[PDB]
Structures are given as structure tokens and as C-alpha cells.
Design a protein around this nucleic acid. Structure first.
Ligand SMILES: [Mg+2]
Ligand SMILES: [Mg+2]
Length: 341
DNA sequence: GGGGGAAGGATTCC
DNA sequence: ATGGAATCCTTCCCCC
């Protein structure tokens, strides 16, 4: 087995530079605007003309408008990018039968019985990377090696517009050598939790006790971080399927009142419930985000699927329950839907 | 002790 | 200040 992964360069920033090319060349910032204050919100994607001056997914729109005030500010057009993305999902599968769609902007492939070798890898990788563009005007980064994870790194350190090759010699050579905060799945928090455990790389996971790893990360990551310090890992292109569908919104005011919380809430449902189309959720969850900026949700499963009425109904129920075991002030309030038939 | 879940918080990504 | 859709992982309880 051998895996090629392909990522979509700053997806969102780009779809929009295919819809309006007068955009290309210049700074571009897709964001998510709240209602709170004029231009209230967070950046969501930015191209390199933006990222390069400090503007990145995460940051308040206002502390962007600070750094590059004459950037093009665009609201988030999600659906518009899901479809485009899917058009490219099927062109990808135009090569592979066992495709793995990791997210709207990422997906892995077993070029296995298709390509045996890094000659005929870099070849066909590139193969697809001009076709995605030609047939769609959209640009990626492809990367090569033995497993999922190891391909993502290939892509991560060559993106954007890039093609990474990685000898199963360097699968190792990485381990010993590479920073570990750069591990698919390893964020700030775990990276953090990890130098306190002494670990700065992969290989360094074989020193330290493992039952001490346990409560520091969980066996989860544990074994996971461990298998990769072996050259093994070797885990196969699953299919994968949306598990949850949610939609979370933000209210013109922190609040604790139900007739004040219901409309936002009830909106989340409509929105979530139209994104469901053809799936029956066996479980719901309302997720409020504390005043003081912490999450507090409250799920519930049932022995069948949930009709919007039920969804409407249990939802207030989850919501009060939350106004109980708590009493700050709920700013953002929303809903997920899980265990689909 | 643990299988089999459901509930809840926490962490990752963009 | 701090959007958001989504998953991941810990603990809880039920009962064999
Ligand atoms: Mg991307
Ligand atoms: Mg990271």
C-alpha cells in the first residue's frame, strides 16, 4: 500500500478568485460577520496576499481591518464552496475507486495498484495537479508516502501550488528530526502538553513512560504517536461519512432569557435541518457558549429519528437544562444532529 | 472487569 | 476581542 493526498490551496479564498478574477493578485479575506458590532466577526480564510501580512483564519475581522485595511472583505459563501469542492471530488475519484474525502478541502487516495514508485508518483501526482486547474481554474498541493498522515506532511511543507515527494527512508528520518506540533491531529494544546512530557519529536515518544503518556494525552494519540515512531502506522483509506450536522449562531446580546434565546435557537434548527436533507438524526445536542467564552452543550439520543417537531420540542428542554446547571450568560447558541439512520 | 452506550468536555482546524 | 462547523476523548451508568 501507498497514499497520495491532495489539499486545495486556501480553498475558500480561491473559489471566490474563480468567481471574480478581478480578485487575483490582491489581498482577499473571507470572513464570518456576526451582528454584535458593524464589521463584528472572525477571518475564515485568507490568501497569501493576506496571510503574508499577518492576516489568518481565526483572527477578529477588526484586528485584520487594522493590518490590511484595504483588503477585500467577503462574507463566507459556504454552500458555494461545498459544491465546487464536490465537482472536484468526482474528478478525483476519476482515478481512484477507494477515495477518502477527509474534508471539503482534503482527501487521500491509494494510487497503490495504479502507481508502484516515486518516479511514477511525482508523475501522476502532478498529473492530477494540472487537470484540477485546467478543468476548474483551482490549484492544490499533492503529496506522497506509505500512509495518510505521512502524505499530509508531504503536502503541509510544500503547499501551496506544490508537489511533495517523500522516500520511505525519510518516513524514518522525519521521526528523528521533525517538530511534533506539526502532526496531523496535534494542535497547540497537545504540543503544549508534550514538551512538559519531555517530547519535542516522534522518536522522542519511545523514551518516556506510556502510562504517563496516557493521562497526558490518552492512549488515543499515545499509540497513535507511537506507531509513527516505528515506520508502521499503516492504516487504510476508510470511506468516512459526516457524523454530525450542526449550525451555531450568535445573538445580538449575551442573554439568559428563553424567549430571547428561542429565535436564534429555532433559526439554528431550520438551517441545520435543511442541511440534513435525506438523513434522520437519532440524537440532538444544544451547545451554548458561555458568556465567559466556554462551551456548554447538552445532548440527547432517542430510539428512532427526530422530526423537526421533536427537534423543535426537545430543544427547549435541552436549553433550560443548561440554564440550570449554569447561570453566566449565553452568547452563541446552536445545534448538532447525530446518529443518523 | 468489562461490554456496550450515552452524555459532556475538550481539542483540532481553518 | 474570539466565527464556526466538526470531531475527538473522558467518565458515567447499566448490567453481565
Ligand atoms: Mg486548504
Ligand atoms: Mg498543528
Amino acid at each position: 500500500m501507498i497514499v497520495l493526498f491532495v489539499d486545495f490551496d486556501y480553498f475558500y479564498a480561491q473559489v471566490e478568485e474563480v468567481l471574480n478574477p478581478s480578485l487575483k493578485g490582491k489581498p482577499v479575506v473571507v470572513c464570518v460577520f456576526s451582528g454584535r458590532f458593524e464589521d463584528s466577526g472572525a477571518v475564515a480564510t485568507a490568501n497569501y496576499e493576506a496571510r503574508k501580512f499577518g492576516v489568518k483564519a481565526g483572527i477578529p475581522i477588526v484586528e485584520a481591518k487594522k493590518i490590511l485595511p484595504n483588503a477585500v472583505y467577503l462574507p463566507m459563501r459556504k454552500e458555494v464552496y461545498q459544491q465546487v469542492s464536490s465537482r472536484i471530488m468526482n474528478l478525483l475519484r476519476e482515478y481512484s475507486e477507494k477515495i477518502e474525502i477527509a474534508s471539503i478541502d482534503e482527501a487521500y487516495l491509494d494510487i497503490s495498484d495504479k502507481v508502484r514508485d516515486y518516479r511514477e508518483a511525482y508523475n501522476l501526482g502532478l498529473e492530477i495537479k494540472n487537470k484540477i486547474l485546467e478543468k476548474e481554474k483551482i490549484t492544490v498541493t499533492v503529496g506522497i508516502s506509505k500512509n495518510k498522515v505521512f502524505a499530509k506532511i508531504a503536502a503541509d511543507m510544500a503547499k501551496p501550488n506544490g508537489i511533495k515527494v517523500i522516500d520511505d527512508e525519510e518516513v524514518k528520518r522525519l521521526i528523528r528530526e521533525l517538530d511534533i506540533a506539526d502532526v496531523p491531529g496535534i494542535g497547540n494544546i497537545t504540543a503544549e502538553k508534550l514538551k512538559k512530557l519531555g517530547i519535542n519529536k516522534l522518536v522522542d515518544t519511545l523514551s518516556i513512560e506510556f502510562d504517563k503518556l496516557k493521562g497526558m494525552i490518552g492512549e488515543a494519540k499515545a499509540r497513535y504517536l507511537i506507531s509513527l515512531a516505528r515506520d508502521e502506522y499503516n492504516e487504510p483509506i476508510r470511506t468516512r461519512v459526516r457524523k454530525s450536522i450542526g449550525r451555531i449562531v450568535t445573538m445580538k446580546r449575551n442573554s439568559r432569557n428563553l424567549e430571547e434565546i428561542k429565535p436564534y435557537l429555532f433559526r439554528a434548527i431550520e438551517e441545520s435541518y435543511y442541511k440534513l436533507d435525506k438523513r434522520i438524526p437519532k440524537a440532538i445536542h444544544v451547545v451554548a457558549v458561555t458568556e465567559d467564552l466556554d462551551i456548554v452543550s447538552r445532548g440527547r439520543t432517542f430510539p428512532h429519528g427526530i422530526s423537526k417537531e421533536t427537534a423543535y420540542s426537545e430543544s427547549v428542554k435541552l436549553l433550560q437544562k443548561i440554564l440550570e446547571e449554569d447561570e453566566r450568560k449565553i452568547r452563541r447558541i446552536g445545534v448538532r444532529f447525530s446518529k443518523f439512520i
